[PDB]
Amino acid sequence: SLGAKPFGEKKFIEIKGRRMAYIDEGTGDPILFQHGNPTSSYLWRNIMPHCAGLGRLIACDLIGMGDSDKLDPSGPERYTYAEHRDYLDALWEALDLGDRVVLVVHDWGSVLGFDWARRHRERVQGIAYMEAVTMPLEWADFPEQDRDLFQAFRSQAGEELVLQDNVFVEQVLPGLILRPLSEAEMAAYREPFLAAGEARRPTLSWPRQIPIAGTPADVVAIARDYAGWLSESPIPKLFINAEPGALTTGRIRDFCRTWPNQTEITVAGAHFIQEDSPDEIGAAIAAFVRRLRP
Ligand SMILES: [Ca+2]
Ligand SMILES: [Cl-]
Ligand SMILES: [Cl-]
Protein backbone atom coordinates (compact mmCIF):
# COMPACT_ATOMS: atom_id res chain seq x y z
CA SER A 1 0.00 0.00 0.00
CA LEU A 2 0.93 3.68 0.19
CA GLY A 3 1.75 5.40 3.48
CA ALA A 4 4.23 7.82 4.99
CA LYS A 5 5.70 5.43 7.59
CA PRO A 6 9.35 4.38 7.10
CA PHE A 7 10.15 0.70 6.62
CA GLY A 8 11.91 -0.91 9.58
CA GLU A 9 14.41 0.73 11.93
CA LYS A 10 17.34 2.99 10.95
CA LYS A 11 20.73 1.44 11.82
CA PHE A 12 24.09 3.23 11.93
CA ILE A 13 27.65 2.18 11.14
CA GLU A 14 30.96 4.05 11.10
CA ILE A 15 32.48 4.32 7.62
CA LYS A 16 35.72 6.22 6.93
CA GLY A 17 35.25 8.18 10.18
CA ARG A 18 31.63 9.09 9.37
CA ARG A 19 28.32 7.59 10.43
CA MET A 20 26.12 6.18 7.67
CA ALA A 21 22.50 5.15 8.16
CA TYR A 22 20.73 2.19 6.58
CA ILE A 23 17.83 -0.21 6.84
CA ASP A 24 18.71 -3.91 7.25
CA GLU A 25 15.78 -6.25 7.92
CA GLY A 26 15.46 -10.04 7.75
CA THR A 27 17.89 -12.84 6.97
CA GLY A 28 19.35 -14.51 3.90
CA ASP A 29 20.73 -13.14 0.66
CA PRO A 30 20.44 -9.36 0.31
CA ILE A 31 17.91 -7.46 -1.72
CA LEU A 32 19.73 -4.14 -1.90
CA PHE A 33 17.67 -1.04 -2.66
CA GLN A 34 19.57 2.10 -3.64
CA HIS A 35 18.03 5.58 -3.82
CA GLY A 36 19.46 8.55 -5.71
CA ASN A 37 18.99 12.33 -5.69
CA PRO A 38 17.39 14.00 -3.66
CA THR A 39 15.92 11.02 -1.86
CA SER A 40 16.95 8.46 0.79
CA SER A 41 16.13 4.89 1.87
CA TYR A 42 12.63 6.36 2.52
CA LEU A 43 11.96 6.17 -1.23
CA TRP A 44 11.62 2.38 -0.93
CA ARG A 45 9.41 2.29 2.17
CA ASN A 46 6.26 0.97 0.43
CA ILE A 47 8.16 -1.33 -1.90
CA MET A 48 10.42 -3.25 0.48
CA PRO A 49 7.46 -4.87 2.38
CA HIS A 50 6.61 -6.90 -0.77
CA CYS A 51 9.93 -8.69 -0.39
CA ALA A 52 9.29 -9.73 3.23
CA GLY A 53 10.82 -13.17 3.90
CA LEU A 54 12.52 -13.37 0.48
CA GLY A 55 15.86 -12.15 1.75
CA ARG A 56 17.77 -9.62 3.77
CA LEU A 57 16.17 -6.27 2.90
CA ILE A 58 18.71 -3.46 2.79
CA ALA A 59 18.42 0.23 1.91
CA CYS A 60 21.36 2.57 2.53
CA ASP A 61 21.35 6.35 2.90
CA LEU A 62 24.08 7.82 0.66
CA ILE A 63 26.62 10.03 2.44
CA GLY A 64 25.21 13.51 3.19
CA MET A 65 21.69 12.19 2.57
CA GLY A 66 18.91 10.68 4.68
CA ASP A 67 20.26 10.04 8.18
CA SER A 68 23.88 9.64 7.02
CA ASP A 69 26.46 12.18 8.23
CA LYS A 70 27.29 15.27 6.22
CA LEU A 71 30.84 15.57 4.90
CA ASP A 72 32.80 18.19 6.82
CA PRO A 73 34.02 20.53 5.39
CA SER A 74 31.53 20.57 2.50
CA GLY A 75 32.04 22.68 -0.61
CA PRO A 76 31.76 22.66 -4.43
CA GLU A 77 34.38 19.88 -4.70
CA ARG A 78 32.61 17.50 -2.28
CA TYR A 79 30.01 14.78 -2.96
CA THR A 80 31.35 13.85 -6.40
CA TYR A 81 30.35 10.45 -7.78
CA ALA A 82 33.83 9.12 -6.83
CA GLU A 83 33.41 10.28 -3.24
CA HIS A 84 29.93 8.73 -2.91
CA ARG A 85 31.25 5.50 -4.37
CA ASP A 86 34.10 5.36 -1.84
CA TYR A 87 31.60 5.61 1.00
CA LEU A 88 29.03 3.26 -0.53
CA ASP A 89 31.63 0.62 -1.51
CA ALA A 90 32.93 0.70 2.06
CA LEU A 91 29.41 0.49 3.54
CA TRP A 92 28.49 -2.47 1.31
CA GLU A 93 31.75 -4.19 2.26
CA ALA A 94 31.03 -3.61 5.96
CA LEU A 95 27.52 -5.10 5.61
CA ASP A 96 28.83 -8.58 4.67
CA LEU A 97 26.51 -9.01 1.70
CA GLY A 98 27.84 -12.37 0.50
CA ASP A 99 27.86 -13.48 -3.12
CA ARG A 100 24.19 -13.65 -4.24
CA VAL A 101 23.04 -10.02 -4.13
CA VAL A 102 19.91 -8.72 -5.84
CA LEU A 103 20.25 -5.00 -6.65
CA VAL A 104 17.22 -2.71 -6.95
CA VAL A 105 18.27 0.68 -8.30
CA HIS A 106 17.03 4.17 -9.26
CA ASP A 107 18.53 7.43 -10.49
CA TRP A 108 22.05 7.86 -8.96
CA GLY A 109 21.48 4.55 -7.19
CA SER A 110 21.57 3.05 -10.68
CA VAL A 111 24.91 4.66 -11.64
CA LEU A 112 26.35 3.47 -8.30
CA GLY A 113 24.63 0.08 -8.51
CA PHE A 114 25.40 -0.71 -12.15
CA ASP A 115 29.05 0.30 -11.56
CA TRP A 116 29.30 -1.81 -8.39
CA ALA A 117 27.68 -4.74 -10.20
CA ARG A 118 30.21 -4.50 -13.05
CA ARG A 119 33.04 -4.52 -10.51
CA HIS A 120 31.54 -7.38 -8.46
CA ARG A 121 29.78 -9.34 -11.18
CA GLU A 122 30.36 -12.74 -9.53
CA ARG A 123 28.35 -11.61 -6.47
CA VAL A 124 25.31 -10.32 -8.39
CA GLN A 125 22.31 -12.62 -8.70
CA GLY A 126 19.97 -10.12 -10.36
CA ILE A 127 19.46 -6.45 -11.17
CA ALA A 128 16.10 -4.68 -10.96
CA TYR A 129 16.17 -1.10 -12.29
CA MET A 130 13.87 1.82 -13.10
CA GLU A 131 14.34 5.44 -14.23
CA ALA A 132 18.03 4.72 -14.41
CA VAL A 133 21.12 6.04 -16.21
CA THR A 134 21.48 3.16 -18.66
CA MET A 135 24.35 4.77 -20.61
CA PRO A 136 26.10 8.16 -20.93
CA LEU A 137 23.49 10.85 -21.61
CA GLU A 138 22.87 13.68 -24.06
CA TRP A 139 20.69 16.75 -23.55
CA ALA A 140 18.08 15.36 -25.94
CA ASP A 141 17.51 12.50 -23.42
CA PHE A 142 16.04 15.01 -20.97
CA PRO A 143 12.34 15.83 -21.19
CA GLU A 144 12.02 19.26 -22.79
CA GLN A 145 10.40 20.64 -19.62
CA ASP A 146 13.30 19.63 -17.33
CA ARG A 147 16.23 20.31 -19.67
CA ASP A 148 16.69 24.02 -18.86
CA LEU A 149 16.65 23.54 -15.08
CA PHE A 150 19.28 20.78 -15.14
CA GLN A 151 21.39 22.99 -17.39
CA ALA A 152 20.96 25.74 -14.77
CA PHE A 153 22.15 23.40 -11.99
CA ARG A 154 25.30 22.89 -14.09
CA SER A 155 25.99 26.64 -14.11
CA GLN A 156 26.86 29.37 -11.62
CA ALA A 157 23.12 29.71 -10.88
CA GLY A 158 23.15 26.27 -9.18
CA GLU A 159 24.19 27.51 -5.73
CA GLU A 160 21.24 29.91 -5.42
CA LEU A 161 18.73 27.42 -6.84
CA VAL A 162 19.80 24.49 -4.65
CA LEU A 163 21.83 25.62 -1.62
CA GLN A 164 19.75 28.73 -0.99
CA ASP A 165 16.32 27.71 -2.28
CA ASN A 166 16.35 23.87 -2.10
CA VAL A 167 14.96 23.58 -5.63
CA PHE A 168 15.86 19.90 -6.06
CA VAL A 169 13.94 18.84 -2.95
CA GLU A 170 11.06 21.31 -3.22
CA GLN A 171 10.49 21.63 -6.98
CA VAL A 172 12.12 18.79 -8.95
CA LEU A 173 11.02 16.01 -6.59
CA PRO A 174 7.26 16.80 -6.41
CA GLY A 175 7.34 17.89 -10.06
CA LEU A 176 8.35 14.36 -11.12
CA ILE A 177 5.72 12.48 -9.09
CA LEU A 178 2.19 12.17 -10.51
CA ARG A 179 0.22 11.92 -7.26
CA PRO A 180 0.22 14.69 -4.65
CA LEU A 181 2.55 13.95 -1.71
CA SER A 182 1.30 14.25 1.86
CA GLU A 183 2.67 16.67 4.46
CA ALA A 184 4.46 13.80 6.23
CA GLU A 185 5.98 12.51 2.99
CA MET A 186 7.50 15.89 2.06
CA ALA A 187 8.64 16.33 5.69
CA ALA A 188 10.62 13.10 5.40
CA TYR A 189 12.20 14.19 2.10
CA ARG A 190 12.91 17.72 3.40
CA GLU A 191 14.42 16.63 6.73
CA PRO A 192 18.09 16.07 5.72
CA PHE A 193 17.97 19.42 3.89
CA LEU A 194 16.09 21.76 6.25
CA ALA A 195 19.05 24.13 6.61
CA ALA A 196 20.21 26.38 3.75
CA GLY A 197 23.81 26.10 2.57
CA GLU A 198 26.16 23.13 2.63
CA ALA A 199 23.58 20.71 4.11
CA ARG A 200 22.04 20.81 0.64
CA ARG A 201 25.33 20.32 -1.29
CA PRO A 202 24.65 16.67 -2.22
CA THR A 203 21.52 17.73 -4.14
CA LEU A 204 23.57 20.18 -6.27
CA SER A 205 26.75 18.14 -6.61
CA TRP A 206 24.64 15.31 -8.04
CA PRO A 207 23.22 17.12 -11.06
CA ARG A 208 26.72 18.45 -11.72
CA GLN A 209 28.01 14.87 -11.92
CA ILE A 210 25.44 13.55 -14.40
CA PRO A 211 27.27 12.09 -17.42
CA ILE A 212 25.86 14.39 -20.13
CA ALA A 213 27.42 15.36 -23.46
CA GLY A 214 30.79 13.93 -22.31
CA THR A 215 31.13 15.72 -18.93
CA PRO A 216 32.26 14.89 -16.30
CA ALA A 217 34.68 12.61 -18.15
CA ASP A 218 35.20 10.18 -15.26
CA VAL A 219 31.47 9.48 -14.74
CA VAL A 220 30.95 9.23 -18.51
CA ALA A 221 33.65 6.52 -18.66
CA ILE A 222 32.12 4.64 -15.72
CA ALA A 223 28.70 4.66 -17.44
CA ARG A 224 30.17 3.73 -20.84
CA ASP A 225 31.87 0.83 -19.06
CA TYR A 226 28.77 -0.54 -17.38
CA ALA A 227 26.62 0.12 -20.48
CA GLY A 228 28.85 -2.20 -22.54
CA TRP A 229 28.93 -4.79 -19.78
CA LEU A 230 25.19 -4.82 -19.10
CA SER A 231 24.48 -5.17 -22.83
CA GLU A 232 26.39 -8.49 -22.76
CA SER A 233 25.89 -9.81 -19.20
CA PRO A 234 23.65 -12.89 -18.78
CA ILE A 235 22.73 -11.79 -15.22
CA PRO A 236 18.91 -11.79 -14.92
CA LYS A 237 17.39 -8.30 -15.14
CA LEU A 238 14.08 -6.64 -14.35
CA PHE A 239 13.44 -3.37 -16.20
CA ILE A 240 10.54 -1.45 -14.66
CA ASN A 241 9.51 0.94 -17.42
CA ALA A 242 7.40 4.01 -16.64
CA GLU A 243 4.59 5.88 -18.35
CA PRO A 244 5.10 8.73 -19.09
CA GLY A 245 8.51 8.13 -17.48
CA ALA A 246 11.21 10.80 -17.59
CA LEU A 247 14.81 9.61 -17.83
CA THR A 248 14.47 6.05 -19.13
CA THR A 249 12.58 6.71 -22.37
CA GLY A 250 13.51 7.16 -26.04
CA ARG A 251 17.17 6.48 -26.89
CA ILE A 252 18.34 5.26 -23.50
CA ARG A 253 15.33 2.93 -23.13
CA ASP A 254 15.90 1.66 -26.67
CA PHE A 255 19.38 0.82 -25.40
CA CYS A 256 18.42 -0.93 -22.15
CA ARG A 257 15.76 -2.90 -24.04
CA THR A 258 18.69 -4.64 -25.82
CA TRP A 259 19.99 -6.07 -22.54
CA PRO A 260 19.95 -9.87 -22.35
CA ASN A 261 17.93 -12.04 -19.97
CA GLN A 262 15.57 -9.20 -19.11
CA THR A 263 11.94 -9.09 -17.98
CA GLU A 264 9.97 -5.86 -18.40
CA ILE A 265 6.79 -4.36 -16.96
CA THR A 266 5.40 -0.83 -17.35
CA VAL A 267 4.02 1.17 -14.42
CA ALA A 268 2.53 4.65 -13.99
CA GLY A 269 5.04 7.35 -13.06
CA ALA A 270 7.42 10.08 -14.18
CA HIS A 271 10.81 9.93 -12.44
CA PHE A 272 10.26 9.09 -8.80
CA ILE A 273 7.92 6.25 -9.76
CA GLN A 274 8.21 4.64 -6.32
CA GLU A 275 5.74 7.27 -5.10
CA ASP A 276 3.22 6.51 -7.85
CA SER A 277 3.27 2.75 -8.25
CA PRO A 278 4.89 1.20 -5.16
CA ASP A 279 2.69 -1.94 -5.09
CA GLU A 280 3.14 -2.73 -8.80
CA ILE A 281 6.91 -2.21 -8.42
CA GLY A 282 7.12 -4.25 -5.20
CA ALA A 283 5.06 -7.11 -6.64
CA ALA A 284 7.31 -7.24 -9.72
CA ILE A 285 10.52 -7.23 -7.68
CA ALA A 286 9.11 -9.91 -5.35
CA ALA A 287 8.19 -12.18 -8.29
CA PHE A 288 11.66 -11.60 -9.86
CA VAL A 289 13.34 -12.57 -6.58
CA ARG A 290 11.10 -15.66 -6.18
CA ARG A 291 12.22 -16.88 -9.62
CA LEU A 292 15.88 -16.20 -8.75
CA ARG A 293 15.54 -17.95 -5.38
CA PRO A 294 13.34 -21.08 -5.87
CA1 LIG B 1 3.56 16.27 -8.71
CL1 LIG C 1 24.65 -18.74 -0.19
CL1 LIG D 1 20.77 14.65 -10.13
UniProtKB/TrEMBL annotation:
SUPFAM superfamilies: alpha/beta-Hydrolases (SSF53474). Signal peptide: none annotated. One of its GO terms (molecular function) is metal ion binding. Its EC number is 3.8.1.5. InterPro entries: AB_hydrolase_1, AB_hydrolase_fold, Epox_hydrolase-like, Haloalkane_dehalogenase_2. Monomer. NCBIfam families: PRK03592.1 (NF002938). Catalyzes hydrolytic cleavage of carbon-halogen bonds in halogenated aliphatic compounds, leading to the formation of the corresponding primary alcohols, halide ions and protons. This is Haloalkane dehalogenase. The gene is linB.
